[PDB]
Amino acid sequence: RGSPLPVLSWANREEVWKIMLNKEKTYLRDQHFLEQHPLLQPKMRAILLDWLMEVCEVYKLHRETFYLAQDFFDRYMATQENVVKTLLQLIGISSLFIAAKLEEIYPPKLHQFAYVTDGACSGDEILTMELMIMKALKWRLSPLTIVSWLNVYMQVAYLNDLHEVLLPQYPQQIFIQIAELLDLCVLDVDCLEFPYGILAASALYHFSSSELMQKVSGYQWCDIENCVKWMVPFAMVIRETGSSKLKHFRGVADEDAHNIQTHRDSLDLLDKARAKK
């Protein structure tokens, strides 16, 4: 698998790329992890993550914050067994608290994370759970999220003549359209079969071509083929309903708004995608 990155002036691109691949390798995800929680059903994971997306939009949190929270939730639940459904809200909101303190300049205060649970989770309960999560994850809290892969691919795609890959230079619509498919896929626990970079490469493929996918990701067709095929009914449901338009957010420059996590009710789309195969 080739290095898609350009010549970087701040570090050697062969090493930066190597450190990224080893990252995706050592962070482990298990599509079967709900089997350790027999009282739980995958739909409850979909409900929880859909709700975290909704919360992220209310507070204008970043897509990376949401996908950090998703990764922390899925990875933490793989470390536990026998969790009851009335606890999922606390685990989810506490994953988002951790993620927002990592990622946001000015994260919402504890009392907002408690507030959005409408009394289900107090501040004290969130502080207890965040330590449970971080300890159980062994403080491994720096994954490459699904959306960070999308950001890398977009940057490589729109590399101009400057090759300064750190300044953003990709257009907003293609980014939010692919993010919107990833946001629907991630609600299906079956997505965890596939490394995050392949989920992002596969979703990108469904909005472009083989040639672009390969150019920006270094993957060959055979590496993503299974994920692409798994994703087909999700792409179709997104195509059928139309891609969302770009939202405006108070205090957020319009040129930065594509970075803010958005939300629409997505559970009917999800069942529609899962009904097709």
């Binding site: 701040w10 570090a11 303190k101 990592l102 330590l131 403080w139 750190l166 970075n259």
Partner: protein
């Protein structure tokens, strides 16, 4: 908990908590312990502590302080670190009478750049490279410590926290209010520290945002559109700024040869895109035959 460790003495108190010297009861290893109180934190575990812990788990390099363990006991978090003897701020102030010898200045700068090159290849900005945060041992090695202000940058970056880095060491693009910043801000701080070691005094000892700007212009010349395209349109820039002129580096840093004035002036290049990287700085001729001496403590 504080079973497996025997505290020996408080040895300092960084802006994050108290630092203790301690001893592992099983191995007899001496360690340092950063105490992060949690009962004084309405937001639970401080974001600076979550960042520092998770980043140091990913960063194992000879010139980065090693995090050995994280202990949760009572309402405290204890960060167990490898033990180093002295920070560079206290080491210079004690050597300021004679200055810091030059063969050591070559090694310490060289090592700080391998630590930094490593961070940047892992896409980590340190954002507080000041001497108090650089830790030396008796064996001559120097290491980056205190990653509480650090941040992992994306590809691409977005706007991050404005006003990072202690003011004396803050790069001019941050002071001018640039929308984006990345690896160049760490290089600038290492330049400030390079020249502070040589002259024994801080290179840009401003005491305000606009004052710190001016101490840089007085020494490097007030930049313009030719040396730094786009500078006059940066948001914290005013046309009323006084137009200073550059100084000979024989005058800013007398003890430095031609190679030293070269490498240094590349680290303090105004335009962040033309500023030298840590990877390139390691290859500069100045580190032709770099040495490894033992310090006087």
């Amino acid at each position: 908990s504080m079973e497996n460790f025997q505290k020996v003495e408080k040895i300092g108190e960084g802006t994050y908590g108290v630092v203790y010297k301690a001893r592992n009861k099983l191995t007899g290893e001496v360690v340092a312990l950063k105490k992060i109180r949690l009962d004084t934190e309405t937001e639970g575990v401080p974001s600076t502590a979550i960042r520092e812990i998770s980043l140091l788990k990913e960063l194992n390099h000879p010139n980065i302080v090693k995090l050995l363990d994280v202990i949760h006991t009572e309402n405290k978090l204890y960060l167990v670190f490898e033990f180093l003897h002295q920070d560079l701020k206290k080491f210079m102030d004690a050597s300021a009478l004679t200055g810091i010898p030059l063969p050591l200045i070559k090694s310490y700068l060289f090592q700080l750049l391998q630590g930094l090159a490593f961070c940047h290849s892992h896409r980590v900005l340190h954002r507080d490279l000041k001497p108090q945060n650089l830790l030396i041992n008796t064996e001559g090695a120097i290491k980056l410590a205190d990653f509480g202000l650090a941040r992992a940058f994306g590809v691409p970056v977005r706007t991050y926290t404005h006003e990072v880095v202690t003011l004396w060491y803050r790069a001019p693009e941050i002071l001018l209010g640039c929308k984006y910043y990345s690896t160049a801000v760490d290089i600038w701080s290492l330049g400030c520290i390079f020249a502070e070691m040589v002259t024994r005094r801080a290179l840009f000892p401003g005491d305000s945002e606009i004052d710190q700007l001016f101490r840089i212009f007085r020494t490097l010349g007030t930049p313009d559109e030719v040396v730094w395209p786009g500078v006059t349109s940066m948001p914290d820039y005013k046309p009323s700024f006084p137009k200073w002129a550059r100084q000979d580096f024989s005058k800013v840093v007398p003890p430095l040869d031609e190679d030293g004035r070269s490498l240094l002036s590349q680290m303090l290049h105004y335009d962040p895109n033309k500023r030298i990287s840590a990877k390139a700085a390691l290859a500069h001729p100045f580190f032709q035959d770099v040495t490894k001496p033992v310090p006087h403590l």
